[PDB]
Amino acid sequence: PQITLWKRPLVTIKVGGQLKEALLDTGADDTVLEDIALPGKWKPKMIGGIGGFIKVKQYENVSLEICGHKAIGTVLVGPTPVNIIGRNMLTQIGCTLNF
């Protein structure tokens, strides 16, 4: 789909059996989810944004369905207030910016 940007580009995702809403975020290197049970091992990670850094749990090879497009990759889990779909995943779904 072609998403304009008059509102937040929120999409439905499916990750770990759960339905979430998430923001297609070209300003995010990484994909970051809140309030998901993600199963298995992970590695400690820090991501920075405006106003500072959060600790996150890095999960590799996580399966994600973003707006009916399957991607597999790194998903950070941590206390972000918005589910973020970052470029690692946006590239996997063929997502581009256009103007």
Next chain:
Amino acid sequence: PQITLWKRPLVTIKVGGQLKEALLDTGADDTVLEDIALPGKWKPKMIGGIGGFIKVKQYENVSLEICGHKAIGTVLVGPTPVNIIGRNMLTQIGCTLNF
């Protein structure tokens, strides 16, 4: 142009006579610039991101050339480590996400 997302979608901008690089950020409501002299009055504002908030100066009706596309709108100036082009400006330049 059609920008893929294999790297940060950084563009050249002109703002207040200055040439900056900025990130086309679909996850930003607002456009936030660092290290620019912006002339005139403003109002105090707070933006939130990952890890917290920053205080910004809000400038209204600021002229921006983003990748050869002129936009006029609200530009926040504050201690962001990345110049951000947010949706208020991305809409003005006709920018969409596509996959």
